[PDB]
């Protein structure tokens, strides 16, 4: 896959009562995310 | 609120067919996230 440490920008949303960052397929491809992967979320 | 640029570690999950990072209340308090806020997600 891609090298770790790539990032993308997103917005916190509500879904099923939870506060979530929804990750689109294209962003998963760009930064190499699969379900189960550890990520870091940083407030901007 | 807190200064921007704080971060926390999480795992990508599936919820309602979407790939999401679920943000618990305590992590929202630590990094100062509200619904609607812009964040950066980085693969580790």
Numbering used by the authors:
A (entry chain A), B (entry chain A): 1 to 44
Please share text taken word for word from the publication where this structure appeared.
E The remodeling of the loop connecting β1-β2 in design-2 resulted in the RIFT-fold protein, design-3. The crystallographic analysis revealed that design-3 and design-4 adopted the homo-dimeric RIFT-fold. Thus, the short In/Del at the 1st loop position is the determinant for the fold transition between DZBB and RIFT. A single deletion in the DZBB sequence converted it into the RIFT fold. Design-2 seems to have a higher affinity for dsDNA than design-3, as dsDNA shifted even at lower concentrations of design-2.
Here, we study fold transition between distinct β-barrels by protein engineering and structural biology technique. Here, we discover that the previously reconstructed ancient DPBB sequence could also adopt a β-barrel fold named Double-Zeta β-barrel (DZBB), as a metamorphic protein. The DZBB fold is not found in any modern protein, although its structure shares similarities with RIFT and OB. Furthermore, the reconstructed OB fold could also be converted to the four-stranded SH3 fold by a simple circular permutation.
